[PDB]
Amino acid sequence: ELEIVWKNIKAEARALADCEPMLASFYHATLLKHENLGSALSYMLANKLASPIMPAIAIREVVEEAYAADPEMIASAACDIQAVRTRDPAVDKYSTPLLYLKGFHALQAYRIGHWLWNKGRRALAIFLQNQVSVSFQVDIHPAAKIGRGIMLDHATGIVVGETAVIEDDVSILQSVTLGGTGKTSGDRHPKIREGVMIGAGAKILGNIEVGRGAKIGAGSVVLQPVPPHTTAAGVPARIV
Amino acid sequence: ELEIVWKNIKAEARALADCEPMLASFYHATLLKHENLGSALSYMLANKLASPIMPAIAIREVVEEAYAADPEMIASAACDIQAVRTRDPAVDKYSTPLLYLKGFHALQAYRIGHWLWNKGRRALAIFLQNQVSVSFQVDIHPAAKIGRGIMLDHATGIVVGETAVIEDDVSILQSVTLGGTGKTSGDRHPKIREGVMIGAGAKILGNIEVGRGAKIGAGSVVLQPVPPHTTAAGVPARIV
Amino acid sequence: ELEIVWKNIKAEARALADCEPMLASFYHATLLKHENLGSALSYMLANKLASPIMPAIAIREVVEEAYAADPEMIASAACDIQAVRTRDPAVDKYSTPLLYLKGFHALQAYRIGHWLWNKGRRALAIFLQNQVSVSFQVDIHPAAKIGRGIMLDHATGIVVGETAVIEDDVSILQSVTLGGTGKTSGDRHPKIREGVMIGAGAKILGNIEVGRGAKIGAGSVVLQPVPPHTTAAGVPARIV
Amino acid sequence: PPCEELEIVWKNIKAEARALADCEPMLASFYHATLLKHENLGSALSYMLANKLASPIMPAIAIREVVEEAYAADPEMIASAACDIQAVRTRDPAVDKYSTPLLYLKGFHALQAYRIGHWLWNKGRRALAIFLQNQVSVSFQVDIHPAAKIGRGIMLDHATGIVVGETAVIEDDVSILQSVTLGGTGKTSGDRHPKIREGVMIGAGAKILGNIEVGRGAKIGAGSVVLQPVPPHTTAAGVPARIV
Amino acid sequence: PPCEELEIVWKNIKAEARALADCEPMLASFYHATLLKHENLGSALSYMLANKLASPIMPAIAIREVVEEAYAADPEMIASAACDIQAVRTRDPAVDKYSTPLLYLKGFHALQAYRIGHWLWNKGRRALAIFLQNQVSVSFQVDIHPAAKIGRGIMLDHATGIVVGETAVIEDDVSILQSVTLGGTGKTSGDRHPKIREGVMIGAGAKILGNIEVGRGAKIGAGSVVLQPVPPHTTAAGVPARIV
Amino acid sequence: PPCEELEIVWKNIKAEARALADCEPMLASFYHATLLKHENLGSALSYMLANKLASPIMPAIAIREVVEEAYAADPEMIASAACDIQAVRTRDPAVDKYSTPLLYLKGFHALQAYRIGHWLWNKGRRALAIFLQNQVSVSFQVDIHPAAKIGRGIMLDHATGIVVGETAVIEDDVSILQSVTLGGTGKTSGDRHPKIREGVMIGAGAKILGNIEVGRGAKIGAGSVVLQPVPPHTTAAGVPARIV
Ligand SMILES: CC(C)(COP(=O)(O)OP(=O)(O)OC[C@H]1O[C@@H](n2cnc3c(N)ncnc32)[C@H](O)[C@@H]1OP(=O)(O)O)[C@@H](O)C(=O)NCCC(=O)NCCS
Ligand SMILES: CC(C)(COP(=O)(O)OP(=O)(O)OC[C@H]1O[C@@H](n2cnc3c(N)ncnc32)[C@H](O)[C@@H]1OP(=O)(O)O)[C@@H](O)C(=O)NCCC(=O)NCCS
Ligand SMILES: CC(C)(COP(=O)(O)OP(=O)(O)OC[C@H]1O[C@@H](n2cnc3c(N)ncnc32)[C@H](O)[C@@H]1OP(=O)(O)O)[C@@H](O)C(=O)NCCC(=O)NCCS
Ligand SMILES: CC(C)(COP(=O)(O)OP(=O)(O)OC[C@H]1O[C@@H](n2cnc3c(N)ncnc32)[C@H](O)[C@@H]1OP(=O)(O)O)[C@@H](O)C(=O)NCCC(=O)NCCS
Ligand SMILES: CC(C)(COP(=O)(O)OP(=O)(O)OC[C@H]1O[C@@H](n2cnc3c(N)ncnc32)[C@H](O)[C@@H]1OP(=O)(O)O)[C@@H](O)C(=O)NCCC(=O)NCCS
Ligand SMILES: CC(C)(COP(=O)(O)OP(=O)(O)OC[C@H]1O[C@@H](n2cnc3c(N)ncnc32)[C@H](O)[C@@H]1OP(=O)(O)O)[C@@H](O)C(=O)NCCC(=O)NCCS
Numbered sequence A, B, C: 001e002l003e004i005v006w007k008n009i010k011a012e013a014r015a016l017a018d019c020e021p022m023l024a025s026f027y028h029a030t031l032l033k034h035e036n037l038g039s040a041l042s043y044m045l046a047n048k049l050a051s052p053i054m055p056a057i058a059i060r061e062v063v064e065e066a067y068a069a070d071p072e073m074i075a076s077a078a079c080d081i082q083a084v085r086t087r088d089p090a091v092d093k094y095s096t097p098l099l100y101l102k103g104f105h106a107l108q109a110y111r112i113g114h115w116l117w118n119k120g121r122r123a124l125a126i127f128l129q130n131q132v133s134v135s136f137q138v139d140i141h142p143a144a145k146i147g148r149g150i151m152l153d154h155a156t157g158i159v160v161g162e163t164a165v166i167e168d169d170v171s172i173l174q175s176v177t178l179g180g181t182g183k184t185s186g187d188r189h190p191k192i193r194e195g196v197m198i199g200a201g202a203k204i205l206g207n208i209e210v211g212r213g214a215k216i217g218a219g220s221v222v223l224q225p226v227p228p229h230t231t232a233a234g235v236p237a238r239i240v
Numbered sequence D, E, F: 001p002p003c004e005e006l007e008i009v010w011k012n013i014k015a016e017a018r019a020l021a022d023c024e025p026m027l028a029s030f031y032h033a034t035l036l037k038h039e040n041l042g043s044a045l046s047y048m049l050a051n052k053l054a055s056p057i058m059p060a061i062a063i064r065e066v067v068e069e070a071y072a073a074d075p076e077m078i079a080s081a082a083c084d085i086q087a088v089r090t091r092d093p094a095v096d097k098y099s100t101p102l103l104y105l106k107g108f109h110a111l112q113a114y115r116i117g118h119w120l121w122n123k124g125r126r127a128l129a130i131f132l133q134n135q136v137s138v139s140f141q142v143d144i145h146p147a148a149k150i151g152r153g154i155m156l157d158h159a160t161g162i163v164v165g166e167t168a169v170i171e172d173d174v175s176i177l178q179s180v181t182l183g184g185t186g187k188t189s190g191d192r193h194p195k196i197r198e199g200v201m202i203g204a205g206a207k208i209l210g211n212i213e214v215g216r217g218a219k220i221g222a223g224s225v226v227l228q229p230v231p232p233h234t235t236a237a238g239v240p241a242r243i244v
Helices: A003-019 A024-032 A037-047 A056-069 A071-088 A095-100 A102-119 A122-136 B003-019 B024-032 B039-047 B058-070 B072-087 B095-099 B102-119 B120-137 C003-019 C024-032 C037-049 C056-069 C072-086 C093-098 C102-119 C122-136 D002-023 D028-036 D040-053 D060-073 D077-093 D099-103 D106-121 D126-140 E003-021 E026-034 E041-053 E059-072 E076-091 E098-105 E108-124 E126-140 F002-023 F026-037 F039-052 F059-073 F075-089 F099-103 F106-122 F126-140
Strands: A177-179 A204-207 B177-179 B203-205 C178-179 C201-207 D182-184 D205-209 D235-237 E181-183 E207-211 E233-237 F179-185 F207-209 F235-237
Touching: A003 A024, A003 A037, A003 A071, A003 A095, A024 A037, A024 A095, A037 A071, A037 A102, A037 A122, A037 E059, A037 E076, A037 F126, A056 A071, A056 A102, A056 B024, A056 E041, A056 E059, A071 A095, A071 C072, A071 E207, A071 F026, A095 A102, A095 B095, A095 B120, A102 A122, A102 B120, A122 C102, A122 F059, A177 C178, A204 D040, B003 B024, B003 B072, B003 B095, B024 B039, B024 B095, B039 B058, B039 B095, B039 B102, B039 B120, B039 D060, B039 F106, B058 B072, B058 B102, B058 D060, B058 E098, B058 F059, B058 F099, B072 B102, B095 B102, B095 C122, B095 D126, B102 C122, B203 D002, C003 C024, C003 C037, C003 C072, C003 C093, C024 C037, C024 C093, C024 C178, C024 E026, C037 C056, C037 C072, C037 C093, C037 C102, C037 C122, C037 F059, C056 C072, C056 F039, C072 C093, C072 F179, C093 C102, C102 C122, C102 C201, C102 F207, C178 E026, D002 D028, D002 D040, D002 D077, D002 D099, D002 F106, D028 D099, D040 D060, D040 D099, D040 D106, D040 D126, D060 D077, D060 D106, D077 D099, D106 D126, D235 F207, E003 E026, E003 E041, E003 E098, E003 F106, E026 E041, E026 E098, E041 E059, E041 E098, E041 E108, E041 E126, E041 E207, E059 E076, E059 E108, E076 E098, E076 E108, E108 E126, E108 F126, E181 F179, E181 F235, F002 F026, F002 F039, F002 F099, F026 F039, F039 F075, F039 F099, F039 F106, F039 F126, F059 F075, F075 F106
Parallel strands: A177 A204, B177 B203, C178 C201, D182 D205, E181 E207, F179 F207
Antiparallel strands: none
16 A cells, blocks of 8 residues: 555656656656655655755654654555545646645645654744745644545645644645634634545634535635535535 | 837836846846847746756756747737736836746746647646746646736736636736536636636636636636626626 | 843743754844844844845845834834734744744835835835745735734735735734725725734725724625624625 | 867767766766757856856856857857867876766866956956956866966866966966966066966976966976976976976 | 774764753754764764765755765775774864864865765766765865775865875875875876875875885875885975985 | 054945946946945955855854954954955055955955954854864865964965964964965974964965974065074075075
8 A cells, every 4th residue: 555655656757767857866866766655755855844944954854753753654645645646637646746746745744743743842843834834835733633645735825723633535725724713712623524625715714523525615614514425615604 | 019028128127227236236137138038038937946956057948948949938928018017007117027926927937837748748847837836826737728918916826727728818816716626537627718807716616618808706616607798706606 | 012022032042942952053043142123033034035136144234224214113023923922822932923924024024115115215125025925925015004913824825905004903814815906096905994803815805994893704805894893704795 | 170179079978978877867967957958068068167156146047148158259268178178088097088077177167267257357347257266266276367368278187276377378288287376476566477388287286486488398397386497398396496 | 993983982972062062052953963863973974974065966865865875885984984083083183072073174074975985986886976076176175086095094184185096095094184195197097196004194285196105104294295105114305205 | 554444445445346336237236235335344344254154054144143243342353354455455466456355355254254263262162163164164275273363464365275273373464375384293282383473475385384483574485394493584495495
């Protein structure tokens, strides 16, 4: 499931190097000279999170440290790759999210932040949170809880709050907010449940819920819970 | 029409250098020491698309190669400059889009991607597509088809799909999606027609159409076609 | 009020350095080795606005020049820090906006642009305007007029026009447009008044007004004025 | 001749590049961008100088324009470069490829950079010539005043420490090693620097001082301090140098 | 021995690092990233070489893989480095910390960079060895052909201008100063560079030319041009050098 | 005097800058940012050092604070710099503008960088002084231990290869060329480096070894190895040097 995603990635690379020599050595460094996904992702993230304050080479040690202490972060990433390839038809390659998709990079960055937050290294997770915000336009609070098989497609704009929850197999799109409402300190953010699909510009406020296999439509503002397998829409959101 | 836009640009530059000496040599390098627009644009794009993987100097050869094989990309750009200057009143100078406007830079980048896609160099057009996505927050699939006299104003957020079409003299604004809907592989993206104007946060889904001289209002979600010279609005969109 | 914000910032720093040694010398350079906020902000902005065309060290002289000729820009910034800390609960530290929040950085950048615009150095303010647009996804025209105690939370997407006005103690959020409407050259942009709160994706068009203690809801398009202490919503906006 | 070298050299570099790309994948794109995507030496050289001279003050993209202006105005600079490449290939036993100077050797780069600066100097663009001379000094540790007159088929391996003064002459086919100084006594102004004639070999650490001539085909011993003229086809060595 | 040095040195560097971090807050994160976050010298060395050899063509992250591959394949390179560090500490009176070579001294960096290039050269990855040799030349002003054979406990302070040819030998415990040339006469090909035996001290500016031997424990005077063999436990000085 | 030089020099640099900006548009903003936007030499010098010493570990913006702290604490460093500029202008026949040292010459930059490091060294901030010394070595190829005592009106053209040891003294108005070594014999510790008195001219490649004195107004021949004291107003040349 993993080793199988990787094998594919390596294959695509070999063929990609053969037909675009301007990026050959990019493909070779990022993919072809790694043994597994853990390696390629560490390399990729290090470059994506690089700054004057922390160069790639120092970030890589942190990502490797996280992946060593929680190997499942690599499995989650594999599922997030499988996801975007089947769900996005414009994506016709496993390598593509790993190489190029800022939603994917932002997502995996978040997991690093999540691991750091939970260990107690909060100061650094906040630096990383805002790094990803400026680099990739995705502002996920690392205290948030996010599962596997997730897709953030065209991700420019996404925001997700401290107490929020997203569960396996969700698909989000641009400008999607999983926000607060007004006043209620403590818990205050959505609990998006399995297999959901949120559309463009979808604001979704308060400590509510969106149950299984649902559908938020583009433009929607969602103040009221959505039951399993339903479909909400409009401003505010009401079932259709 | 072209030579006339350029002449203006050069003039503005001379006066800009004279009254802001901190940017004089910027103006001199970007504009004043070029003979024509082709040159200035190649320079400008090279810098805008620069990365560790491909520095300005290597990108410039690709843009020059494209402009040599299709000189009309330069004419399109001239019309996209004329456009933004007359349509945006905050823009009081021809040089401004060329120098500073990320919608303009993103647009011209797309044309390079479009030329590469069509020639068969898909691997590189995808790298460029996502480059522009991270650099400028505009995610235009290069297989899309876009015409001349276009304005992308304040462009932070724009997304446009593989099968989409935009035609001469359109004006788009921030957060505008020309997206898909749900399920229908093959053709699935809007055909925006001549002289249209799309407003802020305008989601527009499916393989529909928006005819001539139309008007999408800010916030609109557009599932249903709009006839020529009409005006849609709201969630969903209905004529007013 | 100021000296008190600073004292806090310095304290947080000392403790932050002690528990995250990877950023110690970052904290030390940005904060701990400054005497006051003016200094720390000059340092911070210089780094944030740095480009090949203008490195940090040359930008810092401009920011210092502005802060010398208008010391109140520092007081405004202090109030914008106090603001975000009390209003955002995820923010539990005074240092955080100064260090990390792109809405805050963008805001203070704008003030520099505003000072330059008003002095007559328009060419440079436009360079800075678009710098901030690409760096931080906030596109505030510098001719706009913005007061103190402002918060731009998760700011990815904000746009604000030439003739616009925002007054003390406002809170804006992502994707918020304070835009024009159609045709009316001269004055054409909102006058947001004291203590207002604008929500996610809130488009707000024309030379209208939003009076005191108001509330624009997420997703709202606002064509019609809002009286003091009201609350608007939906597409278009009508009181509730 | 120089113009025939233009093509024999480029031909060879291109071939080398294909084989290099196949055998070293980490550099494949480097070899492609610098060499394989170009159709002549001039285009590769401008590419290479631009990256090598790049700085925050003046980036590659901008330097390339300057370098290409100069090549258009005086394409003998490219033919000289061809001869300089040929010189390194045949004379330095450690260099077995034509590409090596062009890609790697700082002496070769400094040498071609001096050519751009000399062209600028004679066009009256002295402010820029001085900027580039000192850039070259810092980046490659070769210091050549742009008013110096230097010919072709020059080998500057391994160039670290070379200093060449304003009024020095170096003619075709000279080989200079590290730490050569072509300078003044300290006593005069105006014409005060040596005149090195052709085919001269100058050994490491040699200091040649004054407006003195070193005649064709002579050899200067490593470590020498040469204060008097050196006849043609002669070896001078010592501190100060005697004819040996 | 080398393997015991691996640990005695690292132990000391770590201690030094804690004290350095406390006393200089502007560098605290530098010391933390380079030294304190690592558990052995090898891991610190790869970190340090990667940053030092980094370029647009090949960034730190990528070089580290190469360096770590080489260390896995031949960990004696790390033990040599340990000895080289020890050498600098005990021999250069201006160096009072083990960390100083590792952090700062370009001679030490060039030396360990040559080791990576030599390993690559003997694996047949010559294109990359040449890229790195010339990188080292530009960044640190030391030029060592990767086919040279160099041992351990080598001090290259203060290394600017050192040139070492393809067929040179430098054995353990040699001390070389600035502007040393280990080169050819100009007359031969093939085996043509000096053989420096152990414990030899070579003074600044010395040129040692030809396939000649300098015997164990000898001393070469600054400024010397050595053309003839130098017996063990002997001092040679002059231009050309005589046994003094 | 030094303080009068502060103003006569700056006056001239500003004038030069206006004329340079007008005649070379590619550098106009460079000249504006470095020179025209400043009101005194100190402010320009800190600007220039900060860019020149910048690195990933420590960027311009941060170095400028350090440099400005030092200038506030001891403004004689700026007056020395003024004298050093004046020295280059009058003594190097190739330099015809006051701006040239400040903008371009690495010897001048290394020299002022040593001043910052020396100030740090005497304040007990040695970790940072060593970081900067070795930065200076790599960037400008001048190696000056920060404990060295160096005065003013010093010309270090064209500085590549200069090495100056911990216990060396160089007094006012000394002129040093490339590849000068002010070092030890190898035999002693503690006080072991030369004492160069004022107005001394040291020629290229000279090695001056031991705690020996070179007396005021003497001249050291290029290539020399000086092992014995040199009386005032005397010329020493040779390997080893004799009074000539
Ligand atoms: C709502 C959506 C998810 C499909 O849900 P569905 O369960 O198939 O619903 P249907 O398409 O059958 O639509 C049913 C009703 O809801 C309406 N509707 C559909 N999408 C809507 C939206 N975004 N907002 C408001 N109403 C909507 C339809 O017009 C129809 O109304 P009617 O019955 O009164 O005429 C889909 O329309 C959508 O919005 N997808 C978003 C994908 C996206 O974000 N794309 C961006 C491009 S990358
Ligand atoms: C719709 C728009 C394009 C103007 O169209 P128009 O053909 O002139 O329509 P009108 O202004 O006459 O408005 C007609 C009706 O539509 C409504 N309407 C206008 N804009 C609307 C919007 N964005 N959403 C929903 N309804 C809207 C009006 O309130 C009016 O309603 P009523 O007759 O029931 O009272 C304009 O209002 C708009 O939205 N422009 C967007 C520009 C933008 O994106 N600016 C961002 C700043 S950079
Ligand atoms: C509107 C808002 C500001 C609260 O205002 P309020 O004065 O407390 O109004 P209430 O919550 O009492 O809601 C009153 C009515 O307006 C409706 N309403 C609330 N928010 C709305 C929105 N964004 N759009 C449309 N209608 C909305 C409610 O459903 C209710 O309708 P009903 O009475 O017909 O059932 C709040 O709902 C909101 O939108 N906050 C935005 C915060 C944000 O942008 N968060 C992003 C996360 S960082
Ligand atoms: C001078 C040199 C070129 C040889 O020239 P040559 O004409 O072949 O001279 P010969 O070898 O016959 O030597 C002639 C005499 O000069 C002496 N001599 C040779 N080279 C000398 C030098 N560099 N300095 C001083 N004396 C030297 C010899 O000892 C001999 O003296 P003798 O007649 O008293 O025995 C060679 O010795 C040399 O200096 N090569 C420099 C190579 C170099 O700089 N670097 C390559 C390494 S990167
Ligand atoms: C050669 C050297 C190592 C000393 O070796 P030694 O065996 O102790 O020699 P001595 O000092 O006894 O000197 C012996 C003779 O050689 C001469 N001599 C010493 N060093 C010499 C040199 N470098 N060049 C020429 N002659 C030299 C002495 O004048 C003396 O001559 P004499 O017998 O006619 O009086 C030392 O002089 C030297 O050259 N050190 C180099 C240090 C250096 O390069 N740099 C450190 C600064 S970064
Ligand atoms: C030594 C020097 C400064 C001249 O000093 P001077 O007092 O004018 O000496 P003179 O020229 O009268 O020469 C005196 C004797 O010393 C010899 N001599 C001069 N310079 C010498 C040197 N560098 N090495 C060895 N011998 C030298 C002369 O051959 C002469 O010998 P003689 O009496 O047997 O004929 C000059 O020759 C010199 O070395 N200048 C260095 C310039 C430099 O390093 N670089 C500039 C280029 S970047």
